[model samples]
Target chain A: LHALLRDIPAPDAEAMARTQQHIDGLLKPPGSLGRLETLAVQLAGMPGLNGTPQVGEKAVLVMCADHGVWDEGVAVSPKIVTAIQAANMTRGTTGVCVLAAQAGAKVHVIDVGIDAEPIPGVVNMRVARGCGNIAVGPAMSRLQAEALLLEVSRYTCDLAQRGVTLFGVGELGMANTTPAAAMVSVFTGSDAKEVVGIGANLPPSRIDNKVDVVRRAIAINQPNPRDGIDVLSKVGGFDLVGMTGVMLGAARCGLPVLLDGFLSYSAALAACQIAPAVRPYLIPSHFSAEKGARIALAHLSMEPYLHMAMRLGEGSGAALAMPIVEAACAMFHNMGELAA
Target chain B: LHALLRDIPAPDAEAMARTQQHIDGLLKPPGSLGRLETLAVQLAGMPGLNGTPQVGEKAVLVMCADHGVWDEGVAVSPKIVTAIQAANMTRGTTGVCVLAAQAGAKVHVIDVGIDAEPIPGVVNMRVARGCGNIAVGPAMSRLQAEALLLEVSRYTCDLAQRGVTLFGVGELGMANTTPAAAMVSVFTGSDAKEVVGIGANLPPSRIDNKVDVVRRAIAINQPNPRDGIDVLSKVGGFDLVGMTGVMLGAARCGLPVLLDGFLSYSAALAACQIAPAVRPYLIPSHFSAEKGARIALAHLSMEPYLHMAMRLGEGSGAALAMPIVEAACAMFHNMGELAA
Candidate 1:
């Protein structure tokens, strides 16, 4: 953890200024590109060694895990579907794969934890078979939580070294939103009911049960509000921790990480709490339909570019946004200068 | 006008329902694709003859014309720049061209009317030298307005026959927003001051003066509120009329038309008012910075996909949105079905 912290570099202010000047030189109204311009400037500041603004080579890091909280009947999909879909992602048959192919991006599925047989093509970095039910007790030990974060940081650094500077975070874990909502409540000091949503279209009665599960998880775990690591250890799932690691690693390597939906949002909140500098490296892709999504985004002071009401989180939203980022860079480079 | 109306076909309801069912069968949560799903379904309903969904062959009709309202000192750029930018668009040197290239789309500059010499590579569809100054008198006679619409319909039908089913509408005109705002006020029954915006970054005092010009134009023309053609002929510019025709033509041919910024929104409002069926064929690309844009979109019940705060016309916003539309179609065709 200390090594990762030491490796994180400050954004290149000089490069960011130069990028803004370049944008202003483009033949469009001043500040007309809106969030794209801001994203370009942020990308310029990232990659501290080189200031070129580009997102041509992008990868989405999909973290797959399982949650014991599924025993509470909070999720619509069965637990086995996580492993099933993770395997399908390798064959490019999943929602994220379909959208990522459109953006000319590749998907890398990482198995932080999943309660299923070993799958080919999925990177196995399992800290445990699945997280313990937080409604009954703490999700994981603090050391295990730290280890998951460290694993993510190492994996992302490897990808960065292979010439991938742009990253998107996604996840797959049944009943993960229960833990995610609990995490948000801990950080934002909101009631569990306010953050809980119909994950996978839960019925009203099940939604109420999901809310109760979140409330119980938070009450039993008693996650420390000030310590993100403590919060993850007590109430977070492996997928969330892995996503947090991806974000932290991207920040350490001066790369931008695009966030997908509510689970990714919870991970981002944890990452930002652990390291404030990581916030600037995060780009929200869309407005998730989950009720907690807007609250989490507002807390981060970030506005999403796509309002497609997308909520299926396998980095699908992030995949859809990659092309927009690429288009912005293309315009910055190809647009002619204003006539003198 | 009657012939064009006769050519318009009904949307394919059966195909649209089948598309929605296919979307539900994809390996994602139901309704998780959000507006993209709705857009795909809408596209399915189009192409009334076959209903095979695709947007591979796309073109942005860059409508160029000079507005006589420029004489009111309401424009930041000189009127001559309209022709210059139209030529630039043909050479693929403009912002729209840069972004359109990224979307694998083409830009076709159409000279509806410009106050300059003819430029090669730009389609010559001039209705007149330019529109009459609306602040002092009617911009065009009723016959001229009808002729412009007919011309647009013919050109669009030609393109559609050439296999261009996906279209985007962009404009190159100085002080066109003055007339666009006036047209919106006529339809929405709002004050010109309420809908007017800074067209190309006019100074605050000049914006105030521009508002007065719109007010005087509306008062002088007395455009019939209930008649779209009457309002367009009395106060709208040649570019707006041409765009209105493109939209109307696209709808009649069972094709989709992507709308750019404030000017395109005004044109869409007119097209929808003239033929309510045209509303289904229109897709908003981005949220324009102009205040009138929101009002127009609300009146049309259309939500824009991109919110980049872009105000640069010339089809730039429409170009940025093409990739998203294409991605939606790709997902619809390529995604695997959920396991039974």
Candidate 2:
């Protein structure tokens, strides 16, 4: 794992400079492309690029797990819905699947730690049945968390080998936002109530209970803000660890990873802490409606491409962002130059 | 013209309500789709829409004209570039053409009043050679302005008859922003300096001159605040009038028009004032980088969908927003319901 972390190379500054020059030469006014221009330059700078970056084949890597935090009644949906939705993802019937299809992105569903029995078609990469309820105990052992992260990194490397240059991170785990909020609270030193929101529209009473659960989880875990691994093992779930690995792996493999809503963004925060170099490779897809999203994005110094007030965390926001990135590249590559 | 304006139908409230209900039923959280949801509902209410509003046959109507205000050195590009870019648009080589192509929108170049000679492949809808310079006098007389508006409406109606339902408004005209800023200044009661911006990266000196030109145009025209046509006739160019016609015709024909940048939005404000019923049919594609854009959107009580800081006008922002609107509909139609 340390070898992979060390293997992540710095983005190519020369290529980025060249890309910027090319963009400036386009017929449009300087900076008129806005974030799209910045995105193209970043893509140019990503590892494995010698010239212009291309996102011809993009995939949304959706990691599915079950969160024992549901025991604290932190979510609106029952815990079993995670498995059902994960299974539905493989059938191309989920929100992320529909959006990914529209964005011309393939969907890969990984059952990293889903609680249900193995269903057909989902990649069986289960790290465990589910993480332990963090409100009273650690979510996973330190070794288990490390192993899960390495597994996700290795899986992403395999996807990169298959020619996937653009990756979007999404997750489906019931009550997962509880751990996410807890992680944000630990890292940002924010009060649990400030980071915690009504996950999946939990009722007002449940929302209060969810906040209490997050507060208790933080108190019990006592995650170290300086050690991302410590925080992940103590308070994070398999989905969070998996997403963190995806970001880290994408960075190592010279791929750009688009982060979805709050959960994936939380994982991104953890990934940035673990390997600060990964920050450049991460693209925020949209501003999640979750309360902690703003804090997490601010911590990462990333501005989301879209502000659709989306809260759905199945990489749906990332899926929506894929085409915008594609269009930026399209403009960069296809637009005419101004007459001298 | 009064008959055409009178024919504009009211939005279908029943269909819009149904769209909102359908959006709520999707797997995502309530109101998560944000502006996209509102846009879908608005499209549902547009004329000839009974069920799910599909923007399958979208057309970006590129209205080409020239502004005599260019004589005051308000724009960086020469006035002849308007004709050059308009001709390039017909060849699918301009910024709007590339983006519109990527968004699956057809491009229609209309030579409304270019200063240069007509080129092949552009629809010649010439109202005049070009409008008179507003910096010194009225851009067009009241009769000419009314005729130009009616011409645009008639042309858009023709496109609708050919089965185009979704329309995006763009334009090619040097020094057009001078008139746009003046129009906004008159309507918003804002000073010219507050609304004038560097068009096509004008030099600081040129920007100062542009601001002065706008102030002088407003002062010289003395446009009536209570009358939209009077304002347009006194200070607006043929391209602005043409775009205004497109919005009005779209409203009358029961089609939705996506507005691009400061110019199209300024035209939308004029359309709304001319026929208040046209307000519901206008969708802002993005917040233009120009200073006047916000003022124009605010005056219309409308919010733009994208804010990429895009100032490249040619309907490029509108073309980029088309796919986002399509994806919203895709999700509403394809996403599965949460399990009972």
Candidate 3:
């Protein structure tokens, strides 16, 4: 963890110059693209393109872990769903891996923790095996949350060194959305129901139960943005902590990160509280049909590239829009303006 | 034109079957993706997707011509702006071409007719060099409208057989949106103001003149759906007729057509009145910030994917969302699902 935090990439000047020149040439009056043009400029500085800006190849690092919060019946399915999906990740039939491969991207799955032991042959990067059950108590200790955050940062740094310029982030955990939504409501000032959802549709009673649990947790902990690390220690899922690490590490290394869905975005907001500059490293892919997603992106004032009403997590939306990053890069290079 | 229409491929059953299977496999409950999933499925049936469904490598066809109706001062810009853009087309620096290239879609410029002699290098498929000026009288004869429509059908048929699966249809006839909005208001029973815009942001008197012109055309023609082809002949711009034909031809070939913005969507409403099934073939790319765009899409029960507050016509919004088509295809293929 210390090794990962010890290194940071120097900002690239040539790429910034290329981006500025490219922005000047977009057919609209200079800067008419608004924030979209700014996004291109920011991306250019990170990838360090000397002559032309390119996203290079796409990669998605999906972090999977389970929170003991499922014991409260917040999720429609049992806690076993975490392990079921962890094993399922190995199956390429899923859209994430399949479309990533189709769009010429690579996906790496990491196991932060699950109730069941790691599936053999699955990529394992466990921080503490499993998170504490938050319904009964805090999900993780301050020390554990920090350790998990460091692990994500470490993995992201390694990927950055390998020339991976673009990343799609996703997570897996049962009942995690409950805690995520609570955290989201706290940060964004939206109502709890606006961001909470059962993994699948749940019975009315079950949904209410999950909402109650989250409300109680928020009441007891009273999370503070000034002490985001401490807030995560009291109420965050393992995957959430890991995702914060990923954003931090990606920002530190100057690689752009594409957030998958509401879960990833909530984690990103936490990272933003920790380090303001980390926000520049993020690109929202899709506004999920889920209310939570709208709140997450709205708080940040970001508009996504796609909105096919996607609610499935696992970085599906982020992976789906990664091709746009490629297109954006292609335009920066191919649409050159003649000397003026 | 008759031979070209005959050559357009008929719908494919196998492709529809494959599309159905794909939809069934999505993570959401059956038919849960609503209109979007249905669009992908119906599009598959149109031309045929033997293997995968991909909307990349597309063209947003912007056909430029002049409306003879402008003599009434319905548009603030002179009809010469049509010729100006026609010349810009081959130069590849037209706003349409620039944004198309930026959005990674090809721009195909067709000069069906615009009151000027044909220039070299432009894709010349002119029906007539010019039409009778309409402010003084009817813009075109019914026979001329049919001729232009046939030429457009031929053009789209050729593109479809060449494997163009996605299209963005647009037009460049000054004051065409005036008649388009009128026709749209009549067909959809919408308020005129709700479906009207300032053509070139005309002065109040000029705007009033444009509205009067539309009212006069509608009253003289009493454009009936029963006389679908006759309606185009009586009041439609040559470019609007061509746009309708391109949409119909693309629908016949089972290709998905994206209505570019206000003028094009107005044409789409006309096409829908002619063949209701064609509605399934259309994707409203942006809710043209223009009032007309909103009223039109509402009548059609379709939503725009992007709303950048766009009022610029040249198919700008459609061009901007081409990459989104790629992302939608990615989502259709990427998310994992449990086996039935």
Candidate 4:
């Protein structure tokens, strides 16, 4: 996945000039868009431009999968909800789609491997049928997970080339956070229990069982934090790997990306490990209630925009913060600067 | 309004049974839902349900008109935003609609008069196109505002019969809060500055003008707070009188009522004055950042569910807290009790 991003063609200069002109014409005082202004400029540079920049279009690709750790009762909801919710994603009535519609953003849901087949007409790109039950073995083969990452890279690059200037990566996999912590534990060298949360507020015993599975996975994988691929291959879920690919792909394409909650940021950590430069492409959307996310953002020196106290994942937090970004852009693009 | 509620029926026995059963099932100890549990039971009693307690099906009515006090230049937004926002309501994309959607509630935009005739499709029960410009005359004739309150009572009673189990009242009148503060000043006997906020972050000069307007309205509307109608006639906006009617209607129909942000609660203050029983029907969604809300809730001795630092009007602060109520309901309905 990292190699695929590295191989993508650099950005264009004409697009950069057009993007800069739009920002210059925005309402607020010059440079008043704050970090957003900086992000657009950096995107301009990535698109290989020396002048103005513009983000003409945006799309967020959400990947869904089922994690094997749920077999150890890692989540409050049954693992079948992994597929059930993937089906729910296709329905447009859910909060994410409703909010997305309000923002006029298109959402594509990918079924990397959710233990069930995709719902009919739900534009799902399945990577595998399901992952190995992680309580007994590695959740997914290292090569298979890498292949998922590569697949995500391809889609992200394709979207960017097709004029999608903003990218957001979301994931849906029951108990994916359990594996996320295992990966975070290996990368950050943290305790499993402290890093894990009550995904849907399950009983303590089941939560403990989930923690043990994560700790055990870390011990068995013994992945080197020095290598992002090695760690992802050993313990990461298909959805997480795909998200990792999306982040790098966006960075390579010079698009500003909004990092979603825990699951998405965990993938971002892996992407940063693979290619440290991708950090410039990302904006931390909010401080997720997830401990892993807090630690990961701090390590990356990222500051979030809102504090809604949202614990429900599924990329809802990032989606909720979209309006703030739009407001910032409007301020930058529509407001007039003070007289010189 | 008080007399209308006093003439209505009593609480239902079946609703109480259902509410109690629902409370008993929550994961916490019996009655641990605290104030929330009380609110649900109170709602059950008012709606007069037997088995299943229907959620908020009532429309939150907001009557909008301009106050004469705007001649004093007390607000930041041009009084034009009043008519514009009232028109914005017809688009169904306003903040109030967003909150109503969250609560599974509807909203009736009553155009009591800001400037223009009601656009087609807007629920325009226009009692008057605009109230007397209070800077030069009474903001409203006591008789005219009283008639408007009666109209609201009629509308509320009509809606409550349609299975509306909850009610909230909102308002949108330019310089309305000047009159509101005037009423608050008389009711709480607080000074003008304490009762007023910098509406729309008004400039110091504008704020001073606002304080002057409130002071003038209070002096002119010397009608005692002892009579709700007298107060409305003296200094209140047409919308506020209507909101008071909605509160009385909620009590009459046996449905619990929720107070939105400071503005909605301010309107309910009149309802409480009209009928003390209406006090039992009022639910505070949040204690807003507004000092007015603090004073208002304090006056009522009511505790709100949330304490986040939100001061934005347009019923946004109250709307965001619906998730908490939903969570409370889900806890009451879904969590199983240990063998007790």
TM-score of each candidate's B chain against the true B chain: 0.97, 0.96, 0.87, 0.89
Q: Kindly list the per-residue Cα lDDT of model 2 for residues A1-340, writing each as its tens digit.
A: 8898899989899999999999998876687777778888989998654468677678999989998888776776777788888777877877788889888889999888998899899988898888899988998999998888888898997888887889999998988989999999888888988898876877776778888888888888789999999999999999999999999888988889999999987898789889998888988778787888889888888777676777878888998888778878888888888854
Question: Who wins the TM-score comparison?
Answer: 1
How far out, in Å, is residue A333 in model 3? 4.2
Q: Residue by residue across A179-199, what tens digits does model 3's lDDT show?
A: 788778788777777677754
Best by lDDT: 1
Q: What digit string (tens of lDDT, one per residue) describes model 1 on residues A1-340?
A: 9779777888899999999998898766677666778878888888633896787578999999999998889888888989888988998888889888888888999998999888999999988888998989988999999998998998997898888868999998888989999999999999888899987878877788888888888877788989999999899989999999999999998888899999999998899899888887888888888989878888888778777877788999998888778877887788777754
Ranking by TM-score: 1, 2, 3, 4
Ranked by DockQ from best down, the candidates are 1, 2, 3, 4
Lowest summed lDDT across 10 adjacent residues in model 1 chain A is found at A47-56
- Predicted complex 4: CAPRI docking category: incorrect
3 versus 4: better lDDT goes to: 3
Docking quality level of the chain pair in candidate 3: acceptable
* Model 4 TM-score (2 dp): 0.60
| Model 2: residue B113 alpha-carbon error in angstroms | 1.8
DockQ of each: 0.71, 0.60, 0.27, 0.05
Docking class of 1: medium
B154-175 in candidate 4: lDDT tens per residue? 7777886687665666777766
Name the candidate, 1 or 2, with the larger DockQ value: 1
* lDDT per residue as tens, model 2, B15-56: 889888888887666765566677778788886555566765
Full-model lDDT for every candidate = 0.86, 0.84, 0.70, 0.65
